[PDB]
Design a protein around this ligand. Structure first.
Ligand SMILES: CCCCCCCCCCCCCCCCCC(=O)OC[C@H](COP(=O)([O-])OCC(O)COP(=O)([O-])OC[C@@H](COC(=O)CCCCCCCCCCCCCCCCC)OC(=O)CCCCCCCCCCCCCCCCC)OC(=O)CCCCCCCCCCCCCCCCC
Ligand SMILES: CCCCCCCCCCCCCCCCCC(=O)OC[C@H](COP(=O)([O-])OCC(O)COP(=O)([O-])OC[C@@H](COC(=O)CCCCCCCCCCCCCCCCC)OC(=O)CCCCCCCCCCCCCCCCC)OC(=O)CCCCCCCCCCCCCCCCC
Ligand SMILES: CC(C)=CCC/C(C)=C/CC/C(C)=C/CC/C(C)=C/CC/C(C)=C/CC/C(C)=C/CC/C(C)=C/CC/C(C)=C/CC/C(C)=C/CC1=C(C)C(=O)c2ccccc2C1=O
Ligand SMILES: CC(C)=CCC/C(C)=C/CC/C(C)=C/CC/C(C)=C/CC/C(C)=C\CC/C(C)=C/CC/C(C)=C/CC/C(C)=C/CC/C(C)=C/CC1=C(C)C(=O)c2ccccc2C1=O
Ligand SMILES: CC(C)=CCC/C(C)=C\CC/C(C)=C/CC/C(C)=C/CC/C(C)=C/CC/C(C)=C/CC/C(C)=C/CC/C(C)=C/CC/C(C)=C\CC1=C(C)C(=O)c2ccccc2C1=O
Ligand SMILES: CCCCCCCC/C=C\CCCCCCCC(=O)OC[C@H](COP(=O)(O)OCCN)OC(=O)CCCCCCCCCCCCCCC
Ligand code: HEM
Ligand code: HEM
Ligand code: HEM
Ligand code: HEM
Ligand SMILES: CCCCCCCCCCCCCCCC(=O)OC[C@H](C)OC(=O)CCCCCCCC[C@@H](C)CCCCCCCC
Lengths: 535, 535
């Protein structure tokens, strides 16, 4: 008797505790059903997959520089001096069933985690989901993005490898040791001495399995709690105002679709862990200071820092008996990037002057300057990311390496400006398109007027029509407009039988009539709620 | 203008978010001010200190069996093959400033964590805090205790040492291989091979710094949330009923005293880490299968399992072509111990019939059978612990080793019975003493009657006095009774000046009658509330 068991367990729960009111509040909480609001959920799900795979990896990984001859199963690396970290990473890859798959899906989950954090940041920045409220949420999210970047940096550096060890030698050692006043002191305190210090990988292992992931988990908890109790903002729409949340309740629809999205995201990650090879450490021999490859790139999230290193024009300063290497330039650049990213909402509010409590998002077109600035920043980030890849770009796409380097150098001041101007004008022209649609109706097929040979597009007004043909122009309301009769009630009722065969006419008529009635009911409910709110 | 800054920050917080009602609820939450309710806080604080010191330790610890010659500073161990784990533990001890202190305070915090968990378990069990509302809390707390025990095991097993290594060899390896159908398979899965498998310490390091601490943190969060929302139970008292919490609010008093208690617990643990030497691994050479020591004990929280191993009388069964060693006996014993501990509240309610919502604690004297059973269990646990220590007990206290082993064997069935009987009768006699006080008043000095030579103790009634000398007996209300006029309004007004010199008589009188007024005001307020609840 499952129903009896469920009722008895509910009574027991509500007797031991009294969670009825709180649980009802959680279930009734309304969440907007916009697709762009699942971008953060992508990052959350990738983080969960990262945790689950990381536990499995920690069950088999041994962090240490203690030198060992492989004497394992991978023949091409046998009798070669390697660290225990590399040896156990190879053991995971080869001598543990499914270990290669687990580590590959872990690395793919890391890449998706970074990418989805970046996409979520784009969404919130361009839709203005940070101003007045949620500004602290944006701040902690920026901290979270930085932590994710460095977490992946320590992760793919964890198995002592030629590629990743070269990346460590470049960034962690050179940049740290070039910093003027305390650079060498930070280097020696991180590495327990010179660069190959015997504690680097154990320290990174601690940082990467417990310390940084613990902070990421705490900040994700704060992030989700803030989103939960500072009700999710929504785009302007029919019944959507600054003092309501139009969407679907947590229990029936939102919960099921979020769980299904989690399932699909982990399916994509597993498919890619299987079908696509990520970080073949067996190909990448053990780290040796004397050995190196030509690629020498970090993961795509640190690729912009690496590209900054490559592009910056070798400017070094030599004060009285001292040196200020080019590493400090990139270090200060990263510091500025992170400071600006963290402090943007406060910078934006100081500049514009808007401290009003904003709960309705604004379409990126409706804010030309901010969308222009975001496009400029994304252009700079892409420029740096491809500058880091200039080696392979030059190799495959036949362009001289010096040409790629100088293309990056010139573009990082030219391309951001070009993209800013183009994005600003593009946003304003999207606004102009919205206004033309508002004042003339949607466009359709052309008709030749009866008496004379006039051609008229035969528009379709979106609002009340004046006594004569032309309609009364509507006022923009911050919400998307239908620019194709395609997406309106025009040519959208195919025979509802099947792909191969029809259904009985009675069933088809019943189905289509019921669907039309449901559409009428939904639109009327939205219209009446909107009228009640604004009247 | 700190006041203005605080006001502006509060307004900004209440504008961005709306935490006014929730924060007021948290601040106004009332917590009973009984000392025994700080026992769980002791464990929580020791856990926090454990986290803080463990992060520092992981910054310097390298888990690996990779063999290395020390070549450090510690002269007595130079050129000796040791695992990198032992080498880095020695490096923490000697070659890191304060690393010895940090690891010692970490181990002392582990011991205090186990001890305070045990004391808190005793408190709740004997006071009946596990009844209907909080059996789930009891269950998760039992899981927490088990996790704490095993994490301490893995923690003092992390630095591969002679003592910890032989303890691992005995408990983990032997008792795992002993298990009949899957013992050897479990051993091979855990160690990745034979006992000295080269993944054991990395696996334990992961389990100990990330996995088990994560589960313990989640369970402590659930525990504290349950205590917070299922308002803390309280002992019977003047104004205390099953539907109220008499105590102090969170903000002014409880928060301050809890923070101060955490400070003092940290101070005790730091003082111990300084003055008392805990696990001096340097005296203990690196683990070798051949080297041994006479002591060979685990930490006190696993000493009971080790004592079970020692005492259980070598009963092995040999099915058709197989063996069932004596280790499986102890494995089943531990299983039974944990099962009974976790399932006691449900066992208690099945036995007694209590399905009532209990919010008033029971005095251990007021619940004899449960008090007797708890005393019997504590006696068994102490017998097992001292049986594990029987080696050192025999060495120092001159008792034959065989004599101690057989004392343990006989007493593990005799001492539990003796302690059960004694505790049951002791509880009933405490009840009898309480009723004697209720019916005769508190006892005082003797007086010789005027006409004849009778001697009367000159009692002091605690309630209304009959028309004649003898008082009207009061009804027992589950609250402690004052058996000394010491603790009542008698002999409690020393000169309030100072230790060496007096104060002006006007000041002394003002202070003393102010205190008298305050204490009688408190008594009257409690009395009025008690009368108001029913009257
Ligand atoms: C970790 C990462 C993983 C993801 C986790 C994050 C998830 C966050 C989502 C939040 C959801 C939530 O908390 O809902 C709970 C929600 C609590 O809030 P509520 O009920 O709405 O109370 C009124 C408002 O809270 C009153 O609030 P308000 O609306 O007036 O606004 C005030 C708000 C102000 O807004 C804020 O500032 C909120 C943001 C908090 C900041 C950071 C705190 C979170 C840090 C998390 C760190 C994790 C590590 O302050 C808060 O409410 C703070 C609450 C903090 C809880 C955060 C939880 C995480 O309700 C429940 O408790 C429902 C669940 C019931 C549980 C019992 C079920 C049966 C019991 C069985 C037990 C055992 C069975 C055996 C038999
Ligand atoms: C980790 C270990 C470390 C220790 C952590 C554990 C501490 C737990 C203590 C709980 C205290 C608590 O949650 O109070 C919050 C409490 C939420 O509850 P409430 O407000 O009473 O809401 C009505 C009741 O919750 C309605 O509940 P009810 O009284 O009707 O009974 C229903 C109850 C049923 O009872 C239960 O079953 C509760 C037990 C929950 C089971 C396990 C959940 C917890 C798991 C934790 C795992 C951690 C890892 O269900 C719940 O309430 C579940 C709530 C779950 C929250 C647990 C938090 C942990 O109020 C607040 O949120 C106050 C704090 C406000 C925060 C905002 C401050 C300013 C914002 C600034 C943001 C950034 C500034 C930048 C500018
Ligand atoms: C399994 C099992 C319990 C087997 C029996 C072995 C055993 C514990 C026998 C009892 C030990 C005793 C009390 C020996 C003294 C001789 C004796 C038996 C006298 C008769 C006992 C009796 C009924 C006396 C009447 C009055 C009475 C109650 C006297 C008790 C006297 C004592 C010793 C009280 C304290 C109890 C106690 C600490 C016993 C030893 C237990 C342990 C584990 C001590 C651990 C310990 C040791 C071993 C150190 O060397 C040490 C060195 C430096 C700093 C700290 C320590 C430390 O903590
Ligand atoms: C970026 C932004 C919105 C900024 C707001 C303004 C602001 C506050 C700036 C503060 C700091 C400064 C100085 C920033 C300038 C440079 C900068 C952004 C530095 C930090 C870099 C960083 C940590 C994060 C930037 C993240 C971001 C939003 C990236 C664009 C990602 C998005 C939304 C892409 C569109 C979504 C989508 C369908 C993508 C798939 C289509 C493809 C393939 C797009 C192109 C593409 C991309 C985007 C790669 O990242 C990439 C990496 C490695 C190999 C190849 C590719 C590649 O082909
Ligand atoms: C060789 C080898 C080892 C292979 C394995 C690889 C490995 C190591 C690990 C991966 C293996 C596993 C275990 C994969 C599956 C992971 C997993 C749990 C998937 C669940 C998805 C699934 C099976 C769905 C079935 C379809 C179905 C009926 C769905 C509806 C019922 C379900 C499952 C609902 C789940 C709801 C859900 C995702 C809860 C997540 C809980 C968390 C952390 C947060 C909740 C939460 C969410 C989700 C928000 O979006 C949100 C947005 C704004 C503010 C707050 C929140 C918030 O608090
Ligand atoms: C990849 C790209 C790089 C990354 C890009 C992200 C960084 C933030 C982006 C842009 C910041 C500069 C914005 C433009 C600032 C406008 C200047 C001005 O002239 O002030 C006019 C305003 C309007 O006032 P109004 O009553 O509307 O009158 C209309 C008059 N025509 O005045 C004010 O309130 C504000 C005056 C002071 C503003 C100070 C803002 C900067 C604070 C320091 C942070 C560092 C900035 C880094 C810059 C890159
Ligand atoms: C681990 C990284 C992250 C996780 C797990 C995460 C998760 C989420 C989720 C699930 C939401 C609600 C759904 C949505 O708005 O799409 C959200 C909202 C938000 N995120 Fe994040 N995000 C992350 C990174 C970031 C970053 C880098 C920023 C900057 C940021 C700022 C915000 C803001 C301001 C909101 C509020 C949006 C709203 O209220 O509509 N987050 N986050
Ligand atoms: C929080 C976000 C995280 C990110 C972005 C991340 C990223 C990465 C990446 C990219 C790798 C390289 C894998 C490879 O090269 O095969 C890695 C390795 C590893 N990660 Fe993480 N990780 C995260 C969290 C975790 C967690 C929570 C754990 C433990 C529970 C963990 C444990 C490990 C281990 C043990 C390795 C070494 C595997 C190997 O050497 O192949 N990671 N991580
Ligand atoms: C990590 C281990 C533990 C921590 C951090 C912890 C913490 C706490 C704290 C602070 C309290 C409230 C204060 C008090 O009642 O003394 C509490 C209550 C409680 N604990 Fe634990 N405790 C632990 C172990 C245990 C164990 C081993 C059991 C069994 C248990 C069962 C309970 C129960 C039933 C309560 C409710 C008592 C009440 O309502 O007053 N806990 N715990
Ligand atoms: C939660 C309860 C915990 C308990 C009961 C516990 C217990 C112990 C004990 C008794 C030791 C032996 C120390 C020595 O022999 O000097 C130890 C070692 C260690 N603990 Fe834990 N610990 C806990 C949590 C943690 C956490 C959270 C971390 C990491 C953040 C950690 C990291 C370590 C490390 C790295 C060692 C080895 C250091 C050494 O060998 O000296 N512990 N643990
Ligand atoms: C850990 C749980 C331990 C479970 C043991 C499962 C024993 C399976 C093999 C028994 C066997 O027949 O082997 C031959 C036998 C050794 O020789 C004899 O034929 C005469 C032996 C007379 C003593 C009988 C005592 C039985 C007590 C147990 C039934 C109680 C278990 C609780």
């Amino acid at each position: 008797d499952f129903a009896k068991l469920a009722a008895a367990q509910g009574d027991a729960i509500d007797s031991r505790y009294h969670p009825s009111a709180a649980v009802r509040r959680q279930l009734n909480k309304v969440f907007p059903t916009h697709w762009s609001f699942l971008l953060g959920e992508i990052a959350l799900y990738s983080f969960i997959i990262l945790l689950l795979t990381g536990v499995w990896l920690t069950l088999f990984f041994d962090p240490s520089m203690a030198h060992v001859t492989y004497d394992g199963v991978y023949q091409p690396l046998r009798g070669v001096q390697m660290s225990r970290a590399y040896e156990t990473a190879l053991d995971i890859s080869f001598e543990v069933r499914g270990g290669l798959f687990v580590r590959q899906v872990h690395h793919w989950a890391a890449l998706m985690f970074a990418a989805s954090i970046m996409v979520h940041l784009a969404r919130i920045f361009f839709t203005g989901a940070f101003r007045r409220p949620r500004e602290a949420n944006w701040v902690i999210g920026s901290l979270l993005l930085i932590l994710a970047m460095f977490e992946g940096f320590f992760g793919y550096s964890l198995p002592d490898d030629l590629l990743s060890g070269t990346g460590i030698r470049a960034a962690l050692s050179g940049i740290t040791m070039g910093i003027p006043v305390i650079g060498t002191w930070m280097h020696w305190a991180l590495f327990g001495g010179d660069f190959p210090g015997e504690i680097l990988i154990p320290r990174l292992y601690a940082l990467h399995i417990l310390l940084i992931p613990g902070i990421i988990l705490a900040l994700i908890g704060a992030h989700l709690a803030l989103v939960w109790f500072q009700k999710h903002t929504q785009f302007p729409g029919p019944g959507r105002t600054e003092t309501n949340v139009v969407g679907v309740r947590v229990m029936p629809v939102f919960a099921v679709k979020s769980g299904a999205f989690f399932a699909m995201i982990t399916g994509v990650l597993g498919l890619m862990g299987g079908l696509l090879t990520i970080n073949p450490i067996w190909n990448l021999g053990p780290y040796k200071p004397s050995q190196v490859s030509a690629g020498s790139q970090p993961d795509f999230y640190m690729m912009w820092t690496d590209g900054l290193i490559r592009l910056w024009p070798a400017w070094e300063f030599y004060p009285f008996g001292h040196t200020i290497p080019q590493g400090v330039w990139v270090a200060v650049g990263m510091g500025l990037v992170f400071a600006l990213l963290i402090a943007y909402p406060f910078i934006e509010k100081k500049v514009t002057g808007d401290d009003a409590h904003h709960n309705l998002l604004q379409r990126p077109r409706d804010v030309p300057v901010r969308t222009a600035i975001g496009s400029m920043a994304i252009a700079l980030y892409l420029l740096l990311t491809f500058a880091c890849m200039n080696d392979i770009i030059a190799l495959k796409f036949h362009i001289s390496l010096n040409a790629t380097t100088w293309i990056g150098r010139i573009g990082m001041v030219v391309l951001p400006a070009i993209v800013y101007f183009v994005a600003y004008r593009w946003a304003i022209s999207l606004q102009r398109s919205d206004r033309e649609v508002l004042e003339h109706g949607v466009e359709t097929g052309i008709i030749k007027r009866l008496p004379h040979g006039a051609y008229v597009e035969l528009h379709q007004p979106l609002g009340p029509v004046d006594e004569h043909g032309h309609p009364i122009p509507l006022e923009y309301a911050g919400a998307p407009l239908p620019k194709r009769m395609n997406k309106l009630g025009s040519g959208g009722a195919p025979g509802t039988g099947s792909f191969l065969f029809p259904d009985p006419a009675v069933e088809h008529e019943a189905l289509t009539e019921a669907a039309h009635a449901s559409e009428h009911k939904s639109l009327t409910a939205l219209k009446e709620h909107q009228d009640r709110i604004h009247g």
